[PDB]
Design a protein around this ligand. Structure first.
Ligand SMILES: [Fe+2]
Length: 850
């Protein structure tokens, strides 16, 4: 007897997912008639000889060893309703012929014969013998069949290690991987799923003119860099070593995530700030429709209340903009409002306190930098400029003021001296930097641990490059706390010059290089060498969502010449290249949270403690919370790796893992290919350690470093991005204005009103959760694996993350932990694992989605 295997295809239309057609606006989704398909009878168009599916057997091979073929069969009727049919999805039924001889299906080929591509989500088979239902999760765009030599193949639910591949599917598995790799030539087309590497020869535009040229980041000892996804474009005409610029930056097709709500297309929203808002805003400044400058602090505060009064003309073209509707509020006509940033929702003035300044190094936008001070004076790593032979000029006499009354030696002994050091990367470029419109210092802040457990700043060292040459060291001045008179204002100016350094390092290193840039060679290596079926592919896959897409954007628009990062932040046109010089010190294994903590002296290893380490400041929120998160990931990654791999030998026998990690190392981070610290793939503990660092980086680290951007920085007074004026000197007229009107002096020193609007527009988006976000650990999409052991393991991650959330909230209810809240009363929630959509100050995503 023949039997018919009963089949269920779930796909989504492009019109349901594509920005241009989803361009109405969207505000509530997970709904509609939870899009039935059915309704609006255009589903009938999938139903002739339009799309064919062809089952592939996993138990029966042909003469040359490959799985037997089913007979190409077309979609047969429209399925209106299914218990799991989600919003915007459409369902089609299709019955395949099989027998007691075509075996157990473990794969299928698919052919779109229609004009338009569609996102196939899943296929489900309801079977024949003593075999349960087979689920296939596809999640991949299917373009017209004419574009492919070998038809689109998908595999079932079952997780297989390469040894565990069913013999009839071994060639198919390997052959997909081959198709994914490519040959490293050609221009990469929209419809392609081809994964490879290039250097960042990408960011500059020397055909527009030589001042638009940027250096090649990567491939070299001066400017080493992580690789980025390969695009195929022609060389620029002027420099054959750079790639020509395009509006249209390729990433492998399935890496670009479509959306159901239009408000959720944040990259388009970001491309819209730079290409539509910026020039229309520019206009209004350049002609004379808004004042060029802020005059008082209340004028900055007026951006959240009354907004920026703008002509109806230009407001008419920035307010029907698709995504940007959710980030701009319009009262009617002359108004462009920003949401109250969470740093001012209680106190407007509290940002200026010394407690908040010191505290935001433990718990703000960049809570990752501070060092425990172990000797004195603090020394430089810099070379032949003479202060890594000399030092800091902050002195023992500067440091003995008010609080305890111990010596600086004794302050170091008892672990109560700490350091924000922003001297070494920005010094060597500082002379160049200061010869643009930027006026900046290379800074140092020495912080004291007080009795209540809070941090208090005790000295700020402001350094300028060279009276008489680089071989002459630094010229440095030193500024002490004062809360009275003109001295108070000089001090608040001295904090502005530190924060400005910090904004910059944060954006290029703590944010861009440490998450975004660095995760990319990992995504490429995984797709080139780990099959969709592979266990580690499935572990690591959620942690990659939309990442190549936002990096493809940033290359076109954030990290490019004259881009937002360049226009906005302290290092200017030197930003991305200085970030590469810092990457010379990037060590993968030091990106593990305990390693980072111990290295910066903020933790020490103690096997009598909660996580086997002990903090030297208890109330270092970022880090007590981070540590809870780190251990949850590393426990999850340990149960998951150790589920699949019985021995270290099974790992060394795993040729997919081995080739993947080889390519990561020798190619993806190939400028670090001889570094002694890379985990070999010799040991299961090494795979756990690297899988935990990939996930930490892409989820929790990216979140701690990213979602606190608009809440802390949406107030430009709190996190300025550029200083454009040196400190007022005693005799000068700038000094009498500092006396007379210090708010005006503050403002002429920081980011101008125009770039502030750009900076606020950018980070407001960068701090938003898209509705359709998939957060840490509670979350994936459907039936990812039929291996219930892994599924159980994942549930234990979710439960523990949930338990951690209650425990973190508990800590923000604690008035004893002062550093969690500040004078600004902003609970530290940036590591709370779950979130709603929007500009929340919380929610850890699986990946770098923005
Ligand atoms: Fe980001």
């Amino acid at each position: 007897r023949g039997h018919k295997i009963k089949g269920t295809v779930v796909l989504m239309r492009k019109n349901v997912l594509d920005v241009n057609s989803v361009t109405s606006v969207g505000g509530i989704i997970g709904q509609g008639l939870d899009l039935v398909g059915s309704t609006l009878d255009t589903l009938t168009a999938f139903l002739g000889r339009s799309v064919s599916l062809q089952l592939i057997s996993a138990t029966k091979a042909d003469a040359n060893g490959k799985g037997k073929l089913g007979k190409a069969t077309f979609l047969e009727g429209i399925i209106t309703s299914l218990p799991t049919l989600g919003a915007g999805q459409s369902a089609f039924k299709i019955n395949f012929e099989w027998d007691d001889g075509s075996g157990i299906p473990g794969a299928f080929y698919i052919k779109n014969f229609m004009q338009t591509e569609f996102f196939l989500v899943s296929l489900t088979l309801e079977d024949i013998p003593n075999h349960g239902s087979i689920h296939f999760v596809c999640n991949s765009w299917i373009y017209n069949a004419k574009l492919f030599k070998s038809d689109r193949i998908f595999f079932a639910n079952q997780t297989y290690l390469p040894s565990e591949t069913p013999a009839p599917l071994v060639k198919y598995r390997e052959e997909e991987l081959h198709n994914l790799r490519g040959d490293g030539t050609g221009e990469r087309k929209e419809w392609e799923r081809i994964y490879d590497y290039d250097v960042y020869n990408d960011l500059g535009d020397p055909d527009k003119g030589e001042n638009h040229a940027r250096p090649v980041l990567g491939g070299n000892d001066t400017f080493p860099y992580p690789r980025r996804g390969r695009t195929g474009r022609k060389p620029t005409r002027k420099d054959p070593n750079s790639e020509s610029r395009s509006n249209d930056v390729y990433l492998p097709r399935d890496e670009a995530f479509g959306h159901l709500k239009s408000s959720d297309f944040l990259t388009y929203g970001l491309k819209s700030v730079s290409q539509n808002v910026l020039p229309l805003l520019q206009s209004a400044f350049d002609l004379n429709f808004t004042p060029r400058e802020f005059d008082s602090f209340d004028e900055v505060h007026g951006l959240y209340s009354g907004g920026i009064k703008l002509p109806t003309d230009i407001i008419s073209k920035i307010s029907p903009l698709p995504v940007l509707k959710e980030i701009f509020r319009t009262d009617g006509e002359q108004a462009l409002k920003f949401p109250p940033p969470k740093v001012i929702q209680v106190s407007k003035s509290a940002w200026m306190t010394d407690e908040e300044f010191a505290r935001e190094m433990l718990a703000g936008v960049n809570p990752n930098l501070i060092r425990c001070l172990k000797d004195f004076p603090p020394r430089s790593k810099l070379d032949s400029q003479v202060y890594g032979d000399h030092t800091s000029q902050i002195t023992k006499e500067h440091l003995e003021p008010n609080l305890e009354g111990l010596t600086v030696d004794e302050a170091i002994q008892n672990k109560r001296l700490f350091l924000l050091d922003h001297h070494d990367p920005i010094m060597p470029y500082l002379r160049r930097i200061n010869a643009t419109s930027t006026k900046a210092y290379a800074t140092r802040t020495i912080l004291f641990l007080k009795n209540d457990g809070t941090l208090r700043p005790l000295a700020i060292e402001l350094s300028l490059p060279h009276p008489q040459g680089d071989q002459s060291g630094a010229f440095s001045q030193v500024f002490l706390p004062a809360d009275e008179g003109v001295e108070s204002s000089i001090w608040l100016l001295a904090k502005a010059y530190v924060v400005v350094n910090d904004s910059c390092y944060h954006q290029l290193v703590s944010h861009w290089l440490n998450t975004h840039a660095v995760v990319e060679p990992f995504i490429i290596a995984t797709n080139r060498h780990l099959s969709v079926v592979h266990p580690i592919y499935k572990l690591l896959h959620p942690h990659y969502r939309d990442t190549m897409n936002i990096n493809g954007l940033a290359r076109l628009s954030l990290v490019n010449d004259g881009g937002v990062i360049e226009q906005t932040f302290l290092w200017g046109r030197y930003s991305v290249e200085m970030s590469a010089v810092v990457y010379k010190d990037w060590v993968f294994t030091d990106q593990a949270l305990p390693a980072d903590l111990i290295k910066r002296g903020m933790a020490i290893e103690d096997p009598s403690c909660p996580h086997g380490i002990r903090l030297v400041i208890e109330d270092y929120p970022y880090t007590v919370d981070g540590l809870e998160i780190w251990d949850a990931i590393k426990t999850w990654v340990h149960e998951y790796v150790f589920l699949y791999y019985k021995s270290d030998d099974t790992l060394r026998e795993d040729p997919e893992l081995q080739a993947c990690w080889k390519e990561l190392v020798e190619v993806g981070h190939g400028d670090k290919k001889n570094e002694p610290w890379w985990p070999k793939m010799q040991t299961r503990e090494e795979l756990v350690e690297a899988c935990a660092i990939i996930i930490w980086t892409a989820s929790a680290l990216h979140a701690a470093v990213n979602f606190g951007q608009y809440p802390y920085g949406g107030l430009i007074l709190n996190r300025p991005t550029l200083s454009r004026r040196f400190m007022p000197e005693k005799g000068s007229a700038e000094y009498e204005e500092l006396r007379k009107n210090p708010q005006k002096a503050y403002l002429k020193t920081i980011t101008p009103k125009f770039q502030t609007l750009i900076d606020l527009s950018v980070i407001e988006i960068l701090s938003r959760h898209a509705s359709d976000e998939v957060y840490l650990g509670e979350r994936d999409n459907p039936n990812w694996t039929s291996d219930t052991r892994a599924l159980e393991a994942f549930k234990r991650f979710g439960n523990k993350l949930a338990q951690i959330e209650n425990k973190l909230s508990e800590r923000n209810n604690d008035e004893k932990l002062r550093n969690r809240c500040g004078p600004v009363q902003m609970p530290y929630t940036l590591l709370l694992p779950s979130s709603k959509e929007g500009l929340t100050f919380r929610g850890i995503p699986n990946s770098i989605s923005i």
